[PDB]
Design a protein around this ligand. Structure first.
Ligand SMILES: Nc1ncnc2c1ncn2[C@@H]1O[C@H](COP(=O)(O)OP(=O)(O)OP(=O)(O)O)[C@@H](O)[C@H]1O
Ligand SMILES: Nc1ncnc2c1ncn2[C@@H]1O[C@H](COP(=O)(O)OP(=O)(O)O)[C@@H](O)[C@H]1O
Ligand SMILES: Nc1ncnc2c1ncn2[C@@H]1O[C@H](COP(=O)(O)OP(=O)(O)O)[C@@H](O)[C@H]1O
Lengths: 370, 370, 75, 370
């Protein structure tokens, strides 16, 4: 009996260890109302969380507590974890030990303060923080190979060979789902359809998930988009109003492969995956090309795998065979790994206990992280 | 054609026209179409069903005001064509549009359909030699005569902050919010009804804009002025009747700096300025704080510069020099910039010829913009 | 001044500028290392009359004809 | 030749240029090509798409930085051509390349293709009378005015140790390691992200280099200073914001002494020096240990001399006299050596003439360099 709780910037995936898929999946947001001095009606919650805030988007100002895999407002994150254990999962945190997930190369204060809350506020019996990328490999039953776990908050590239990780080869890029969502708003505003508010940004994320797809040749796709209106698809908003996004459909996910569009002055998700493999030892490169995994929900774009293969193959040597690993459950790839890890009898020892926390302090986490 | 170019500012509130030779705009009239309020069947009433600028101001109470441009976007194009036709009337300028070339001043990050249709009208309806769409912010710097400078241009329709350093505008650091002078006029009408004076009519909305422009001071501390008993300064209406404004005077334009009070999800005028600087690169931040320029009519509020300086200082880093350099001609700054730009021999290269638009296509106007 | 006197909607009796108040090697002094003063004029004089023999010079990774020592002798 | 020969110390971090005979290099500017990343909209902005040296330093925030040479190997030659062109331009020495001979200063044990292309550019693109390529270490000994000494030259790009006894330099005892000042700045950036301050931008990476030079001390005992709670020393960024560096201050420069931290299997700077002496013949070991000369900018770290003297003493034999001598101008020591060598009449014989290069080709340069 143990709890796996993925603390993703976009969506918080929580559930019991051993189960196939996560029990409760809700958007990680806190909804505070745009209140005036006028008195409010009955059935009023001071701050709404998750699926409740997703229902009452109209009035509530949606504030994401985790920004680029860094917890900015801890009071907000506490209210999400309270919604996770007590309401969503229907379980006491004192009974079950809780596994959390942190992105690699995050600030040290993040891991420090995270565990402090779990030990003091919720009074958990044991707490282990893990790298999202390390878990994602277990999903595919692969010990060897690199992963390109692109989330809503961040995208990170962690090469692991024969159950041994290369820490110095790890590269983090701040370009992620929320930056693409923010980019899609700007180009939709250029077409005509203006989306400004926090509630409207959530509707633009629903537009992104459904329509947007990765093009094989961007320049070739822009030529077909100009000539014919075949790529132009219609989407119905919450309001009866319908919109035809056009070429901006395949223009949004292009930002992943060339950040110049967003204006970050950084390497693309294809180029960073190559650079990470080159930073590793020369011998093991072979297996990393052969076992390139794509994880998170930012790798569920239709035809990212095809475009990824093409771009890596061009950069990589001709003799090498480049196979991209795209399992059907990419969105729940971080959690399903956690469920496999927590269930294993070997992992029982690796848990950090309250007694261990009390004596040493919150600094113990940095030793027993990975 | 060598004959003098005609600058025209597309201000949502007030459109400012004139020749490039003039130091100031000779002809500047309100941007609204005036039709008779009662649907005219009979003779001896207001004939034509069109009253623009000074003719409208004379017979204002009889007519019904309808603004053609909202939030820096043209809603009714038929109305805007009549307005631009009145610019080339016997009343203002008194010239052929076919002879003189034109310069438009569209707000930043507007819809591309707005720019394309604006060009189509000025090339097809009027037989213009050449047209050039420009950004309102870039012009404001030419007027003042400095290359580096952030331009907080608070218009009637839209308030936007564009950072430009050494003649280089960062397009990602641009910030645009719809809460502008027109919204302040709308919110003042609500507070005037809370004082007990209704301005229900579209004509009666114009005198609320006059009340705002005459008497509305921005308090340095809003909470202290609320507790203090007001003088209740009397304003005289067109009919002759007096109205005591009282606390509505100062707590109306406050909604610029704090738009959450009414319940509008926006950043605020102090916030968009700071955010635009913070979004730009770290090296430039100090110079961009050291060079801020106020543009448009919604900066002329009494004690605006006093409040903004205080509200920017607390958000901005400690011990940083913040100079908010307002010109004396803030309202007419955007046009004077265009008048200087138009006069230069470089402008001859920048504009798009009528034959160029026929051959090249639609993109011609967009690609030459920058 | 007379230009802005003509226009109606102009700021009168207002300050133009709103501004804030104007606010007014450790290794090279180490014990471990011995600090030398570089005098190129002195150095130039010491090497002044020193020459090199560039005849039969080959520093390259050429195997032929045993070992070589570049810069044979002066004068 | 009557015209003085120009000394150019082609350093990875800073390229130092000047005329032979001069006591100090008159014109020393940072080695990078700055291109504007933001768009030009206004007229009168900064002219050219290439900014090099002091103009690039002033307008750093505007530009995207790109180092042409990495680890003493010219990666992009087009860029290296533009910086050498800028040395001869009006801003720096302001003379024709055809009239003055050149003295280039490359690192030891660099690729042969680098020396070949370096010559090709300096003879074809610039029609120079004569070029001599020399080692950095050999010059550093002429500057101090000593015939016997080992030269530990820790530069920005590469750190190397060359044992030189009574004029002769031992080519098999040369020790070179890629880990250097620029890897310390790269390793500092990684630890600053762990502390929770991000510097993703190429312009922001120059601020990390500024933080390194100002606030970073090498602790005499590494394991001792790790455990003890450190005083969190605040540093002021260009914008004004304060960062607490904390443990990253002293952990960052330790990379030079322990290359295992970044994860490269190479010798430490302390191991490089002793290995270079131990590789030399038995008789000269005592004289080389007595005569150690530190060079390059990366030796200027606070407590470098103290730590190195501690580390060398443990690896070196018992009861041997270890005197580490530092010239006050460590940074400019390499160039001053070049000026003294260039001023001698013996340098005339050492040169490769144009005709000599044109006849034999690449071989002539390889024959006469060490
Ligand atoms: N099918 C899809 N196609 C395209 N984009 C998607 C799709 N599903 C989700 N996204 C986008 O990618 C993000 C995926 O978030 P996800 O559910 O993987 O959680 P997360 O916060 O990224 O967690 P983690 O970092 O642990 O992977 C969403 O926020 C959304 O913006
Ligand atoms: N003297 C003034 N005091 C206060 N508000 C003013 C004043 N003059 C104009 N305004 C406000 O500013 C608006 C004018 O905006 P304007 O500068 O013409 O915008 P644009 O830059 O788009 O042309 C008016 O409609 C009014 O709301
Ligand atoms: N005061 C300082 N403290 C620490 N490191 C420094 C200091 N000054 C310069 N450096 C480092 O030394 C570098 C300069 O290298 P330099 O000696 O000019 O190279 P080269 O010897 O290859 O010509 C800088 O880029 C920086 O990384």
């Amino acid at each position: 009996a143990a709890l796996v709780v993925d603390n993703g910037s976009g969506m918080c995936k929580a559930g019991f260890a051993g189960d196939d898929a996560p029990r409760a999946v809700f958007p990680s947001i806190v909804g505070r109302p745009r209140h005036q001095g006028v008195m409010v009606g009955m059935g009023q919650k001071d701050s709404y969380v998750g699926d409740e805030a997703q229902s009452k988007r109209g009035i509530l100002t949606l504030k994401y507590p985790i920004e680029h895999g860094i917890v900015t407002n801890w009071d907000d994150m506490e209210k999400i974890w309270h919604h996770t254990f007590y309401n969503e999962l229907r379980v006491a945190p004192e009974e079950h030990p809780v596994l959390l997930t942190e992105a690699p190369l995050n600030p040290k204060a993040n891991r420090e303060k995270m565990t402090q809350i779990m030990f003091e506020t919720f009074n958990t019996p044991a707490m282990y923080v893990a790298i999202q990328a390390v878990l994602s490999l277990y999903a595919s039953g692969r010990t060897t190979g690199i992963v390109m776990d692109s989330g809503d908050g961040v995208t990170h590239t962690v090469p692991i060979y024969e159950g041994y990780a290369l820490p110095h080869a790890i590269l983090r890029l701040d370009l992620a789902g929320r930056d693409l969502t923010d980019y899609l708003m700007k180009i939709l505003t250029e077409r005509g359809y203006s989306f400004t508010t926090t509630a409207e940004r959530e509707i633009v994320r629903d537009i992104k998930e459904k329509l947007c797809y990765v093009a094989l040749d961007f320049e070739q796709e822009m030529a077909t988009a100009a000539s014919s209106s075949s790529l132009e698809k219609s989407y119905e908003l919450p309001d009866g109003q319908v919109i035809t996004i056009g070429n901006e459909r395949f223009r949004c996910p292009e930002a992943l492969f060339q950040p110049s569009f967003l204006g970050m002055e950084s390497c693309g998700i294809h180029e960073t995956t190559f650079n990470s493999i080159m930073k590793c030892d020369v011998d093991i490169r072979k297996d990393l090309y052969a076992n390139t995994v794509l994880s998170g929900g930012t790798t569920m774009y239709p035809g990212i795998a095809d475009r990824m293969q093409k771009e890596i193959t061009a950069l990589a040597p001709s003799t090498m065979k480049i196979k991209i690993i795209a399992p059907p459950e990419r969105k729940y790839s971080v959690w399903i790994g956690g469920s496999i890890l927590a269930s294993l009898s070997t992992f029982q020892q690796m848990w950090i206990s309250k007694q261990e926390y009390d004596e040493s302090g919150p600094s113990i986490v940095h030793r027993k992280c990975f | 054609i060598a004959n003098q170019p005609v600058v025209i500012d597309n201000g949502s509130g007030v459109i400012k026209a004139g020749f490039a030779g003039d130091q100031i705009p000779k002809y500047c009239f309100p941007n609204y179409v005036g039709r008779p309020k009662h649907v005219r069947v009979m003779a001896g009433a207001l004939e034509g069903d069109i009253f623009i600028g000074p003719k409208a101001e004379e017979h204002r109470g009889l007519l019904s005001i309808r603004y053609p441009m909202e939030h820096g976007i043209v809603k009714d194009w038929n109305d805007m064509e009549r307005i631009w036709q009145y610019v080339y009337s016997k009343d203002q300028l008194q010239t052929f549009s076919e002879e003189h070339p034109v310069l438009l001043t569209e707000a930043p990050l507007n819809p591309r359909k707005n720019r394309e249709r604006a060009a189509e009208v000025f090339f097809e309806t009027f037989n213009v030699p050449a047209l050039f769409i420009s950004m309102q912010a870039v012009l404001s710097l030419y007027a003042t005569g400095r290359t580096t400078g952030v331009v907080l241009d608070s218009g009637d329709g839209v308030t936007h902050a564009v950072p430009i350093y050494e003649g280089f505008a960062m397009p990602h650091s641009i910030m645009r919010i719809d809460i502008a002078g027109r919204d302040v006029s709308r919110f003042l009408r609500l507070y005037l009804r809370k004082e007990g004076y209704d301005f229900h009519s579209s004509s009666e909305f114009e005198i609320v804009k006059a009340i705002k422009e005459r008497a509305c001071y921005l308090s340095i501390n809003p909470q202290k002025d609320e507790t203090l008993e007001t003088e209740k300064a009397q304003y005289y209406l067109p009919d002759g009747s007096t109205i005591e404004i009282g606390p509505s005077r100062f707590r109306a334009p406050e909604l610029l700096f704090r738009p959450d009070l009414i319940g509008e999800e926006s950043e605020g005028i102090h916030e968009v300025l700071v955010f635009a600087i913070q979004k730009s690169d770290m090296d430039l931040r100090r110079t961009l704080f050291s060079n801020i320029v106020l543009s448009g009519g919604s900066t002329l509020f009494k004690g605006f510069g006093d409040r903004l300086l205080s509200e920017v200082k607390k958000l901005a880093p400690k011990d940083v020099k913040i100079r908010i350099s307002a010109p004396q001609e803030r309202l007419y700054s955007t046009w004077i910039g265009g008048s200087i730009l138009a006069s230069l021999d470089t402008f001859k290269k920048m504009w798009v010829s009528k034959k160029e638009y026929e051959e090249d296509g639609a993109r011609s106007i967009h690609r030459k913009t920058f | 001044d007379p230009k802005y006197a003509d226009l109606p909607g102009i700021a009168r009796n207002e300050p133009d500028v709103y501004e804030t108040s104007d606010l007014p090697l450790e290794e090279l002094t180490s014990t471990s290392v011995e600090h030398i003063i570089v005098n190129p004029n002195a150095a130039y004089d010491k090497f002044k009359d020193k020459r090199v023999g560039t005849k039969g010079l080959d520093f390259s990774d050429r195997i032929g004809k045993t070992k070589r020592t570049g810069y044979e002798s002066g004068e």
